[PDB]
Amino acid sequence: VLSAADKNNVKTTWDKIGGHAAEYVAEGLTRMFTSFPTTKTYFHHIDVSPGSGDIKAHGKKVADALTTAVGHLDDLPTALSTLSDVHAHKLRVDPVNFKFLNHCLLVTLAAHLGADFTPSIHASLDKFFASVSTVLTSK
Amino acid sequence: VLSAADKNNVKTTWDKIGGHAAEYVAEGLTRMFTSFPTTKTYFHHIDVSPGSGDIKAHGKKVADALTTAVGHLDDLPTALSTLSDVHAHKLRVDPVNFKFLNHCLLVTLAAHLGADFTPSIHASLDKFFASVSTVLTSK
Amino acid sequence: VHLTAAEKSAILDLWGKVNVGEIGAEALGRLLVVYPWTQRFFEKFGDLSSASAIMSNAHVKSHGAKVLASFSEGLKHLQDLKGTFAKLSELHCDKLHVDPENFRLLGNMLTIAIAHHHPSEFTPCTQAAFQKVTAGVANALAHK
Amino acid sequence: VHLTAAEKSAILDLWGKVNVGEIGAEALGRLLVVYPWTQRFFEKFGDLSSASAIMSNAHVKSHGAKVLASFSEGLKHLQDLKGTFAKLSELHCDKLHVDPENFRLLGNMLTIAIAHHHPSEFTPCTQAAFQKVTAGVANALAHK
Numbered sequence: 248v249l250s251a252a253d254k255n256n257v258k259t260t261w262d263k264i265g266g267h268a269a270e271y272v273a274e275g276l277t278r279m280f281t282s283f284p285t286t287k288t289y290f291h292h293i294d295v296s297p298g299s300g301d302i303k304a305h306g307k308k309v310a311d312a313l314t315t316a317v318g319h320l321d322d323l324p325t326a327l328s329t330l331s332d333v334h335a336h337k338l339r340v341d342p343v344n345f346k347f348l349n350h351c352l353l354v355t356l357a358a359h360l361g362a363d364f365t366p367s368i369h370a371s372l373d374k375f376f377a378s379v380s381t382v383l384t385s386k
Numbered sequence: 387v388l389s390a391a392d393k394n395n396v397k398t399t400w401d402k403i404g405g406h407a408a409e410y411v412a413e414g415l416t417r418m419f420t421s422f423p424t425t426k427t428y429f430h431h432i433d434v435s436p437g438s439g440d441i442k443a444h445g446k447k448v449a450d451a452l453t454t455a456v457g458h459l460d461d462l463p464t465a466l467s468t469l470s471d472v473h474a475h476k477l478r479v480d481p482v483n484f485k486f487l488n489h490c491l492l493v494t495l496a497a498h499l500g501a502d503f504t505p506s507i508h509a510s511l512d513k514f515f516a517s518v519s520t521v522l523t524s525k
Numbered sequence: 526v527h528l529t530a531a532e533k534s535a536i537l538d539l540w541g542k543v544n545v546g547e548i549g550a551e552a553l554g555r556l557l558v559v560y561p562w563t564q565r566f567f568e569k570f571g572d573l574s575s576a577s578a579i580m581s582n583a584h585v586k587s588h589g590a591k592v593l594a595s596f597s598e599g600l601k602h603l604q605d606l607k608g609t610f611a612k613l614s615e616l617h618c619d620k621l622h623v624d625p626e627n628f629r630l631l632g633n634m635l636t637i638a639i640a641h642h643h644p645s646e647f648t649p650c651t652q653a654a655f656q657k658v659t660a661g662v663a664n665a666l667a668h669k
Numbered sequence: 670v671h672l673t674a675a676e677k678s679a680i681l682d683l684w685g686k687v688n689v690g691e692i693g694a695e696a697l698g699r700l701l702v703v704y705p706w707t708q709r710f711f712e713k714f715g716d717l718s719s720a721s722a723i724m725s726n727a728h729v730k731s732h733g734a735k736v737l738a739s740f741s742e743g744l745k746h747l748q749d750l751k752g753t754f755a756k757l758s759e760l761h762c763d764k765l766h767v768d769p770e771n772f773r774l775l776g777n778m779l780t781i782a783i784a785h786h787h788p789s790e791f792t793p794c795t796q797a798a799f800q801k802v803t804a805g806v807a808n809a810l811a812h813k
């Protein structure tokens with residue numbers, strides 16, 4: 248459950264990251280594939296090698312959906328309805344994979360955001376990503 | 387995230403259980419204390435031995451709060467606000483303890499509800515209890 | 526696993542009455558309804574897109590029976606769960622890539638299955654013994 | 670743990686530059702902010718009711734340093750993590766009752782702490798080695 252403070256930390260950090268988000272997310276994907284190779288299984292159909300254009304392209308789709316989540320913090324189940332379909336009905340993704348990805352995302356932000364990645368910013372983002380996870384694994 | 391079907395399964399099962407709920411919950415507590423003895427730590431101040439009156443009395447408080455959750459399935463964070471305080475700010479309860487308790491609750495219902503405890507009823511109750519857990523461990 | 530002598534006999538006393546095929550069908554059938562992402566691992570079985578199709582599927586009954594028979598076998602070698610389960614560990618870990626968290630969910634479905642079929646015998650003490658054993662079996666499967 | 674020779678040297682190369690006290694303060698300080706129920710285990714430290722009080726507390730800095738020094742020590746006995754960590758296992762498991770899930774959260778805070786302090790050196794490969802090691806340390810702590 249995000250507080251009102253958590254929501255402001257999430258909105259403020261997401262707007263500052265801005266146009267970099269797709270970059271940060273590709274790097275998150277690359278970190279997940281390399282630290283948890285088992286997750287490559289779900290991506291057998293694309294080139295998952297480090298700087299691939301499939302990864303940038305997928306990084307962008309994921310960034311965009313997270314931007315949408317940031318715009319609808321008060322009703323994520325409705326904004327992310329369609330992504331729930333994809334992740335819980337069509338792909339049947341093990342939720343352990345979301346922990347992997349969330350952690351690789353925070354790892355990336357901790358590296359790029361420097362001093363703006365405070366313990367409070369960090370705590371709020373972690374609750375945000377867990378909340379997106381719970382919805383995407385849904386039904 | 388509970389669907390509309392999940393909500394009906396939860397409301398229907400809770401109303402059928404009815405006046406037994408406090409009984410079922412005491413038995414849940416006794417099962418948690420005996421299968422996961424580490425959870426007794428949080429209850430050092432009461433008699434936690436099997437049929438104790440402290441347990442019945444606490445079983446009732448817990449049943450009542452779950453009844454309130456069943457009445458407000460669409461906004462649990464607001465109905466359970468005060469219980470979040472108690473569990474996440476005051477007691478600082480490890481969320482692993484909620485998994486223990488949820489499982490002991492389903493174990494009890496599977497034993498007492500017989501044929502009404504179908505795989506679908508079971509799935510809906512599990513999502514319900516995980517959702518109550520996420521709120522109570524909140525901030 | 527410790528497992529004291531009282532625990533082992535709580536477990537065996539009940540196990541002597543258990544129907545391996547019914548419990549195993551109940552356990553695996555609930556795993557797939559309750560934790561839907563586990564269906565991914567069994568798509569060779571056919572349609573698993575509803576509770577009704579899961580509870581009716583012959584490969585689920587038959588696989589659930591197979592899983593319980595090997596749990597049953599593990600129960601006769603309580604002192605060496607890792608040795609007993611080492612080939613299944615390899616299969617599940619290296620060939621199938623099943624996150625270990627799922628082993629624990631099946632162990633829990635199996636506890637629920639025994640409470641649902643043996644209401645009167647499955648007392649808090651009897652459940653306590655079975656949680657350790659299911660926890661041991663999960664840990665022995667996760668060993669590779 | 671496997672740990673190949675390339676993994677061990679990814680780990681040692683970076684570790685040679687690491688400030689044990691800063692990383693350990695960062696790691697333990699984030700564990701308590703991010704996963705608030707862990708505060709329960711350290712109430713002997715004083716007020717932990719805000720990020721500001723956590724990040725300022727001298728016992729958190731000093732304990733975080735102590736925790737990282739023993740991680741550091743573990744790194745020189747990569748072939749026997751269980752033996753190395755067996756007394757801490759007993760302490761954490763039997764005296765303090767810390768659910769093992771929490772060991773893994775600290776291992777993850779420690780990875781974040783190293784990415785935050787060594788932006789340029791903490792590449793996907795270097796992170797990969799450190800995840801196994803932190804996973805090994807967690808598993809060795811959970812062993813009793």
Ligand code: HEM
Nearest residue numbers: 286289290308309312313330333338340344345346348379
């Ligand atoms: C923060 C979590 C995530 C977000 C916001 C997100 C967003 C997306 C989006 C926007 C798509 C494209 C949907 C479409 O094209 O209609 C997608 C597809 C997919 N996702 Fe995710 N996702 C997330 C987490 C995960 C995780 C943890 C995994 C798997 C280990 C995962 C595995 C996949 C796979 C295999 C596809 C299909 C890709 C394709 O067809 O090329 N996602 N996701």
Ligand code: HEM
Nearest residue numbers: 425428429447448451452469472477479483484485487518
């Ligand atoms: C389904 C989850 C739960 C519900 C619906 C619930 C409800 C309650 C209620 C209604 C109280 C009394 C609050 C008051 O008197 O103001 C309470 C107190 C408490 N709860 Fe829970 N609770 C739940 C789960 C948990 C768990 C998993 C644990 C711990 C292992 C836990 C540990 C405690 C403790 C130590 C107290 C204080 C009791 C006292 O002062 O005698 N609860 N809970």
Ligand code: HEM
Nearest residue numbers: 563566567591592595596613621623627628631632662666
């Ligand atoms: C209590 C823990 C478990 C036990 C004792 C167990 C036991 C077994 C056994 C005996 C087999 C048959 C091996 C053979 O035919 O040689 C098997 C196969 C299999 N297991 Fe498990 N299992 C467990 C948990 C799980 C979990 C949690 C999953 C996945 C969610 C899973 C997925 C599979 C799959 C996909 C097969 C192969 C079925 C086939 O295609 O023939 N197992 N397991």
Ligand code: HEM
Nearest residue numbers: 707710711735736739740757765767771772775776806810
């Ligand atoms: C990476 C995993 C961990 C390592 C390497 C580690 C290491 C240590 C060390 C070296 C000590 C000092 C022992 C002594 O003074 O003899 C200690 C004590 C302690 N640990 Fe951990 N620890 C870990 C994880 C955790 C976690 C997750 C918790 C709880 C959330 C925790 C709670 C405690 C507590 C309460 C003490 C005693 C502090 C005191 O009162 O003096 N530890 N640990």
